[PDB]
Paper text:
Recently, [name], a low-affinity arginine transporter on lysosome vesicles, was identified as a direct sensor of luminal arginine levels for the [name] pathway. The bulk of [name] are 11 α helices that pack against one another forming a TM bundle that transports amino acids and functions as an amino acid transporter. Collectively, these results suggest that [name] is a “transceptor,” which is a membrane protein that embodies the functions of both a transporter and a receptor.
Here, we report a crystal structure of drSLC38A9 with its N terminus but without the substrate arginine. We used the antibody fragment 11D3 to facilitate the crystallization of drSLC38A9 in the absence of substrate. Each asymmetric unit contained two copies of the drSLC38A9-Fab complex, arranged in a propeller-like head-to-head fashion. However, instead of an arginine molecule bound, this time an unexpected electron density was observed, which extended along the solvent-accessible tunnel leading from the substrate-binding site to the cytosolic side of drSLC38A9. Electrostatic potential analysis indicated that the transport pathway in drSLC38A9 is generally positively charged, while the N-plug is largely negatively charged, suggesting that the interaction is electrostatically driven. TMs 1, 5, 6, and 8 of drSLC38A9 form a V-shaped cavity into which the N-plug inserts and is stabilized by several bonds. At this juncture, the N-plug is jammed in between the two essential TMs 1 and 6, where it would probably prevent the TM domain from transitioning to an alternate state for transport.
Author numbering:
A (entry chain A): 80 to 83, 104 to 159, 176 to 221, 237 to 246, 268 to 287, 297 to 370, 378 to 453, 468 to 519, ...
B (entry chain D): 1 to 133, 137 to 219
C (entry chain F): 1 to 215
Write the structure that this text describes.
């Protein structure tokens, strides 16, 4: 899921299911942060840009160009993707467990959650039974739950919008209580999410080991993201509520007991649990269980103090995407050329303004 | 303790403007919406426009686009509404309220600002004590406050100690002047044997006057 | 714009009885749950939120306030009526961009009939020395609201220059009160000796007259 001998058809499907998962949950919040129109433009451009940079990786441990400050540099940012994704897995399993359990303790609504006797909200009650498992892998036997979750999840989103979905108005640069402008100054926040959502570069080399294939793959992936993003942003009941209410996990804009969402949450919980341990084998392959309890400890700590899917994904994606998606594939190519220079520097500059634009707040 | 405290009564001259404030203590200001509402003679409540402070996004009713102007001060956690070029029909009571998106309605309100739109100039009141005219059981004695403008006029008996048996009748206009009266009924045991005073305050003319009720 | 039509206009319920205010909306105010709200407003005081989302009770409100309704028709019910409920009640819709209220319902608590404690007051000398003289006349704590005061100056029913004010219904007594100030000049006040404050009401067929002579 997330970031990381084939007859083209299964190649595209595989690239799709790999990039699909809990990544799709933050798209509505991203559009909201940029404005509707400006967000749609960003999704397309960022789809196209990451495709070029994934092409570039295909044309290339590499990094002999730099050596030392290159071999290590690829590792840290590849580590940023991995350990950063192990954190957001921890948070989302907590929320989904919490609602999956709170549901089974003995609802068509939309909620603007008040930002922060049943004591069922604990991220520690899962570290105890879930930390040894990454010391061991076999968990890849359950990749079908990835599609099952994505299948049911998409079914969920369509069913919802059919029920309540005709609310749009176009305040272009002004604001209304219920509607956000179409062009909002927080447009960088959308870009950061997309970098981590559009990232397979760390493993596209091994994935394509089995180019028309890639273009259809990101197109299918890119169009998959645009669907959910627009339905949830449009169908958000906007005369009664407001589109500023869109939570970074849009399943959190729904109550503790949406049965359909609970099915989706239970499915997402099923899938998500069968994929975290792999990242533990993935992180260490990149001599006690100290590192390996370190990432486990990082998950638990994050969910108890700062649990915003939106901030985490945008910062990590822009960070590891600074190098692994923007500059380095452009540096690899330009040096390998022993008008185009200006274009590729502009790509370098976007990766810079990506990170710097996340600090501007 | 959620508290919304608005501005003081205003006497704006026809064609002028005023700004009404609403200082909010007791909750995180941005986690809620500030609305404004208008109440005009006895019955008739009108929505008036409203603003989500987090994204500064106001939304008005058409009827009031061009009179009301919403704004908020995120540091002072206050809300302000400007009313522009007023007429007689704008003499109303303006309320401030609080909304969370949809999970409710307007739960906590404001005390209310009473705007009086008129050109009659502020005149200060004449307090006359109403002595009793014979007595038997219990004596009601009164106090007549005559000839004042604008209407915020505060009358207490015995500086507030005497809260019971009071009837503070509402004001009426006669020839651009108000008159207010109040009665207090106490026991033949308690008067004239104790001191009873009519305390009148017209903040608008900086008038504070006390008037003791005497037998002649 | 959703037009909300609230009935009754004015309602009278006996103490201890049931009051059923009703609301009807032009359009649909249900989004995924109903978005009408009921409010209470006593005189001179800010509105108070009774029932939100048509049928949910706000923290602190007595359970005697109940709400029902969906879609187009809604009703508010105060199951045991109390004199602290003598107010005007409105309804609010929060669903569409132009928010609208209702006609209002003025609830009057019917209590046992009570007669006025009528008291007459001669002009304060502090006024006669400033010129002018008015005869105030308090009629306090009575029920029902309707009452007639006939100022008579030497018997002659003088109805020119009388000025009245009524109180809203008491939150505890459920009574009303009125002040009739008959204003004259200092000159015209000393042209007559009798000043009577003749008050008629449901309680007495014979008016309750409080009078004085200038000497």
């Amino acid at each position: 899921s997330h970031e990381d001998k084939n007859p083209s058809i299964v190649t595209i499907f595989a690239i799709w299911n790999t990039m699909m998962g809990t990544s799709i949950l933050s798209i509505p919040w991203g559009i909201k942060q940029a404005g509707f129109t400006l967000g749609i433009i960003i999704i397309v451009l960022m789809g196209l840009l990451t495709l070029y940079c994934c092409y570039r990786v295909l044309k290339s441990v590499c990094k002999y160009y730099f050596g030392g400050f290159g071999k290590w540099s690829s590792l840290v940012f590849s580590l940023v993707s991995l350990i950063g994704a192990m954190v957001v897995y921890w948070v989302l399993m907590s929320n989904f467990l919490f609602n999956t359990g709170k549901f089974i303790f003995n609802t068509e609504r939309v909620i603007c959650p008040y930002p922060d006797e049943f004591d069922h909200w604990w991220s520690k009650t899962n570290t105890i039974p879930f930390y040894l498992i990454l010391l061991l892998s076999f968990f890849a036997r359950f990749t079908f739950l990835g599609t099952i979750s994505v299948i049911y999840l998409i079914f969920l989103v369509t069913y919802k919008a059919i029920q309540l979905g005709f609310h749009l108005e176009f305040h272009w640069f002004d604001s209304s209580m219920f509607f956000v402008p179409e062009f909002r100054t927080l447009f960088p926040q959308l870009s950061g999410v997309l970098t981590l959502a559009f990232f397979i570069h760390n493993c596209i080399i091994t994935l394509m080991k089995n180019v028309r294939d890639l273009s259809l793959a990101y197109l299918l992936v890119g169009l998959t993201y645009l669907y959910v993003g627009v339905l949830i942003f449009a169908a958000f009941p906007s005369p009664p509520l407001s589109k500023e209410c869109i939570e970074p996990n849009f399943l959190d804009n729904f109550p503790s007991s949406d049965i359909l969402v609970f099915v989706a949450r239970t499915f997402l919980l099923f899938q998500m649990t069968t994929v975290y341990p792999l990242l533990g084998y993935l992180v260490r392959v990149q001599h006690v269980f100290v590192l390996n309890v370190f990432v486990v400890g990082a998950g638990v700590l994050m969910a108890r103090f700062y649990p915003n899917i939106g901030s985490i994904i945008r910062y990590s994606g822009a960070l590891c995407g600074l190098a692994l998606v923007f500059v380095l594939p452009s540096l690899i190519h330009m040096v390998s050329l022993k008008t185009s220079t200006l274009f590729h520097g502009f790509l370098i500059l976007l990766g810079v303004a990506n990170l710097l634009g996340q600090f501007f707040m | 303790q959620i508290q919304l405290v608005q501005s003081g009564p205003k006497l704006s001259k026809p064609g002028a403007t005023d700004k009404i404030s609403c200082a909010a203590g007791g909750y995180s200001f941005t986690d809620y919406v500030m609305n404004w509402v208008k109440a005009s003679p006895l019955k008739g409540l009108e929505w008036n426009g409203s603003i989500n402070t987090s994204n500064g996004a106001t939304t008005y009713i058409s009827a009031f686009k061009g009179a009301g102007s919403h704004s908020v001060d995120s540091s002072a956690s206050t809300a302000a509404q400007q009313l522009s070029a007023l007429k007689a029909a704008d003499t109303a009571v303006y309320f401030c309220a609080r909304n969370f998106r949809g999970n409710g309605a307007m739960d906590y309100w404001g005390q209310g600002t009473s705007v009086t739109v008129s050109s009659a100039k502020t005149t200060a009141p004449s307090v006359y004590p109403l002595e009793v005219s014979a007595t038997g059981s219990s004596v009601t004695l009164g106090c007549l406050v005559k000839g004042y403008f604008p209407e915020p006029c505060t009358l207490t008996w015995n500086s507030g100690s005497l809260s019971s048996g009071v009837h503070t009748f509402p004001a009426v206009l006669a020839s651009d002047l108000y008159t207010l009266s109040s009665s207090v009924t106490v026991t033949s045991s308690t008067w004239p044997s104790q001191s009873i005073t009519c305390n009148v305050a017209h903040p608008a003319s900086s008038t504070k006057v006390d008037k003791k009720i005497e037998p002649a | 714009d959703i037009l909300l039509t609230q009935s009754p206009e004015s309602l009278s319920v006996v103490v201890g009885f049931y009051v059923t205010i009703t609301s009807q909306a032009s359009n649909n105010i249900t989004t995924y749950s109903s978005f009408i709200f009921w409010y209470q407003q006593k005189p001179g005081q800010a509105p108070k939120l009774l029932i939100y989302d048509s049928s949910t009770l706000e923290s602190g409100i007595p359970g005697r306030f109940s709400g029902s309704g969906s879609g187009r028709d809604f009703s508010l019910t105060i199951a045991p009526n109390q004199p602290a409920c003598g107010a005007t009640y409105e309804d609010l819709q929060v669903l569409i961009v132009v928010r609208t209220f209702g006609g209002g319902t003025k609830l009057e608590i019917k209590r046992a009939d009570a007669a006025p404690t009528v008291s007459i007051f001669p002009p304060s000398s502090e006024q006669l020395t400033s010129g002018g003289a008015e005869v105030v006349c308090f009629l306090n704590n009575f029920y029902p609201k309707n009452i007639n005061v006939a100022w008579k100056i030497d018997g002659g029913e003088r109805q020119n220059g009388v000025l009245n004010s009524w109180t809203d219904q008491d939150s505890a007594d459920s009574t009303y009160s009125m002040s009739s100030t008959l204003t004259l000049t200092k000159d015209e006040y000393e042209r007559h000796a009798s000043y009577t404050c003749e008050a008629t009401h449901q309680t007495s067929t014979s008016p309750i007259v409080k009078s004085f002579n200038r000497n």
